């Protein structure tokens, strides 16, 4: 059986959990949310063959910068997520996570994810936002951001609405799909 | 370069333009539709190589049961679509479709597609589809027919509001990809 390693990664609230959970579990976590990350499977085909996707959700908290590189080894794909109501987590894509990914997997693909994109239209949202002149980020701004730090494409989604979370993950194996060729690929390596 | 033939069939009026277009132009053709039978072409990135997507719209019209097949060489994957909202075109899919291109390829893969699911919650539609005895067709019947007919999975989505739309394409792809060695080939052939 093949497999596929993706690798989620983002700032602490962003909503990687519940992004995961949704997909995973097709319903949104409004319960308890397992407040303590975990480690998913979901069997896809490709070509009429089952592939075995493999999902690590991480911790974002800096004390955790010595730890959460630890799961990065054999990744085939990344996530770096962002909420698109969050600046501070968009902001610390391009300065915190993607540094992180391309230094020890540097030849490893990974998609920007804007997340809980439900919460942009949301008015009880951007009434606290202009609370700092700041608005929602757009998907151009990020889509810009994606050019640059040179991410394999942009995609974003709702963990509650379930919008676009499959494509996300969609995406996520067309970019994870390795090549045949003399073992060229993009894994993630010690 | 590489690519993958995607031929698209379903009575006529069920949407197969209309989805057409608003996957590869992001925009419902809300003012008129475009009479031509045409194929469309999009770039698609897989594990971060270009691949073209071929589509191509078909005349569902008994009228030409004796050309329509002319298409359906090459063929990669099929998309028999059927509205959730006709009932007649539901029933041509195990009636008339997927014997048709079972028929002309044996070995080719194809997804059940459910369009204008829109309308499914349309007032309306329902009240005229329930004056004639009727009711739109619900996924798990849908679902039911795409085990039965083996079809590689159910779909449904809305062109019109784009729901799924990306989603129906993403798993034409993951179905369609295909396998090393040239001689599993599951390319429709004359
Ligand atoms: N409400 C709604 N109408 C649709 C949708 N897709 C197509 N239609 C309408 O369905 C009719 C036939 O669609 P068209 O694409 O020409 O059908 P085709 O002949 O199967 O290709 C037209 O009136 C379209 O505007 C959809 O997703 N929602
Ligand atoms: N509106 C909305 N809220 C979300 C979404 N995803 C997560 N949340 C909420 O955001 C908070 C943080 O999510 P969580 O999964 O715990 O984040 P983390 N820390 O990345 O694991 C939670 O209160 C959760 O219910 C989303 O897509 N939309
Ligand atoms: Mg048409």
Redesign the interface.
Known sequence: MQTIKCVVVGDVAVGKTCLLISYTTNKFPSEYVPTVFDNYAVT??????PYTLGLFDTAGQEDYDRLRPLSYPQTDVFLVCFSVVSPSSFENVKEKWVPEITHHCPKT?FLLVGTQIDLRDDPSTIEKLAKNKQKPITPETAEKLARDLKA??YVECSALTQ??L??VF??A????????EPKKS?RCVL
Chains 1, 2 share one sequence.
């Open positions: 896809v085909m490709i070509g009429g063959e693909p394999v494409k919008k676009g499959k494509n969609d995406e194996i067309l970019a994870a799909l390795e090549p045949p993009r």
